């Protein structure tokens, strides 16, 4: 399924600005990203929000190369 | 009093009007036995046994059929009657038995409550079949 450089760069751009707002819950991460970003495609917004969640669960247990 | 529910699988659609009465469950005019194929009569009869005759003796269910394939119509009828009995349990008769009814329903089968999404996909270009091609020569 993977993803593209667009989603990778979007994930790198986000969180670095509003990390404290983002939590460990996938649904709340979706809701936060919904108003954090401005891209009007709901499907890839959901995709990138899931990307934010799966990147956030990589936090706090080792180096993550970013943020 | 009276409730209305719907059931849709394939092209066929079905409605279910659940009302109080003496046990008058009529498939429009023709009974639920004169359909002819006993093979599908068995599937018609399946939901009744898992619920009980006494519960349906107090309800009258009006069944309207409007076109569709032989299997699609009976499956839509099953969806409609399942939604109707669930709604009437949640509304008028009894809520405690509704939980056990839905539990045993989901235990036995899944298509009884919610139907399938399978439908005739628009045949593409290339062959008479939906995913076939015309024979090609050299």
């Amino acid at each position: 399924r993977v993803r593209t450089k667009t989603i990778k760069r979007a994930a790198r751009q986000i969180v670095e600005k509003y990390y404290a707002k983002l939590t460990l819950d996938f649904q709340i991460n979706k809701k936060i990203t919904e108003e954090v970003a401005i891209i009007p495609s709901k499907r890839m917004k959901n995709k990138v929000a899931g990307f934010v969640t799966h990147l956030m669960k990589r936090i706090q247990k080792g180096p993550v190369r970013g943020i | 009093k009276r409730v209305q529910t719907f059931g849709k699988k394939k092209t066929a659609v079905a409605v279910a009007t659940v009302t109080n009465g003496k046990g008058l469950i009529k498939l429009n005019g023709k009974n639920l036995d004169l359909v002819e194929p006993y093979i599908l009569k068995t599937k018609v009869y399946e939901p009744l046994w898992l619920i009980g005759s006494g519960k349906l003796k107090n309800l009258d269910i009006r069944i309207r059929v409007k076109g569709g394939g032989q299997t699609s119509q009976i499956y839509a009828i099953r969806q409609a009657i399942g939604k109707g009995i669930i709604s009437y349990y949640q509304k008028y008769v009894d809520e405690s038995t509704k939980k056990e009814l839905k539990d045993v329903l989901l235990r036995y089968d899944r298509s009884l409550l919610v139907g399938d999404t399978r439908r005739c996909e628009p045949k593409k270009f290339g062959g008479k079949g939906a995913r076939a091609r015309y024979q090609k020569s050299y």
């Binding site: 751009q13 600005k17 891209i39 495609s41 | -």
Partner: protein, 157 residues
Amino acid sequence: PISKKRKFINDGVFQAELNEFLARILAEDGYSGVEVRIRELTSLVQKRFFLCAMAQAESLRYKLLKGLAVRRACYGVLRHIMESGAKGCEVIVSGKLRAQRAKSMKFRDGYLISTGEPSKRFVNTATRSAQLKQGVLGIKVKIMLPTSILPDNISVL
């Protein structure tokens, strides 16, 4: 007494006539509106019945029909469309061009989105032909209107 579908078909063919007539007569100026000079156009329409890609393409078609250098004409019109504001423009010229061998040259500048329904919505098309000594020359003008906003763009403050 006409059915709605056949009425809309008649409206469509009438508007097709209108658009081809606009292409035929509108030569000296760009898009300045439509009517639902002007006196004679209204009279002829009544008697019969009873930035801009088109403008830029028309300008460059005039430039190439006048016999001026093709490279200079396309460079000038490309400067013009950049100065109008589009992120890029693609001009394709196909035909004789000094040789019996048919050839074509491409000019790359801008974003140049080339497929997808968002691309179709945000990018319009112009295509024409011109007569010359030994045939016709076909010109394709592609300008992308600056982007609602393009879905591929992602940016958060």
